């Protein structure tokens, strides 16, 4: 092909990405909006730095490292955390998906670091396609977080409208209050 | 007389509300959920401790000094502060009403501390009825804020429902995600 030349290149591409995000992520904990650093889905959950790293990677990346959107994500997660019934679905986003993706990427990166020559032709073929599926997932996710955010923003907007009109109704003066 | 006897008692009355709230408010001060202590309606607004005291009095009172409802009020005010257009209507609640009420209360308390005997019969009557209107309003406000907390609570609820539903739809798995294109 060479598939082993492709593979090695596709591995340098994502090992660069990793270095870019490593920096971008470093700055966010510098500027102090790295909520994921402390984030636990439940009360007494243990937090592993390496598992969180992976999660930051995908979540901060999809959000384009923007502070406004990372704050907005934090608020969404915080809202859902209130009800133990939402613990599971949050984990699916935070772990199964956000960590899960980085985990697959790391195994892929490893198979390449181990030597593409030590791979059967058909193994090299799966690795390549597998990598590409992971890259595609990242994008699917990015497009879903975009919607997640457009839904949250709308909601926030509606709440503002409602709240403001309630104030400009019962709060014009004393006369506009609650008769007993 | 003897509206004098009435006034005097309606005064030790609201002077009691003051010592109780003074304590209740004091607690909230070290329990560090007293946002009114640092709350400005606008960017570079000056904060007077005495004017804030009055506001805490009515605001924290109407919220039976419940730490949670006080947090909820803080969030409502914070949300509206974002748009400059809402500066006025916030002030009407915070100042004209919340401070305004305590201010009238203090003048009333003073007329009594000054001596009810130094008051005409006409004056004595108006004072009494005026006090009662203040004590009436103090309730209107309490009941209104509660409705306000309901409006906020409802909204919060709706947002939870919407968000969860969205989450369950898209985050169930990799396959539930939106298309890449």
UniProtKB/TrEMBL annotation, chain B:
TM region positions: none
Name recorded for this polypeptide: Complement regulator-acquiring surface protein 1 (CRASP-1)
Stretch of the intact protein here: 70 to 250 of 251
UniProt keyword terms in alphabetical order: Coiled coil, Plasmid, Signal
Domain of life, source organism: Bacteria
Ranges in a coiled coil: 1-31
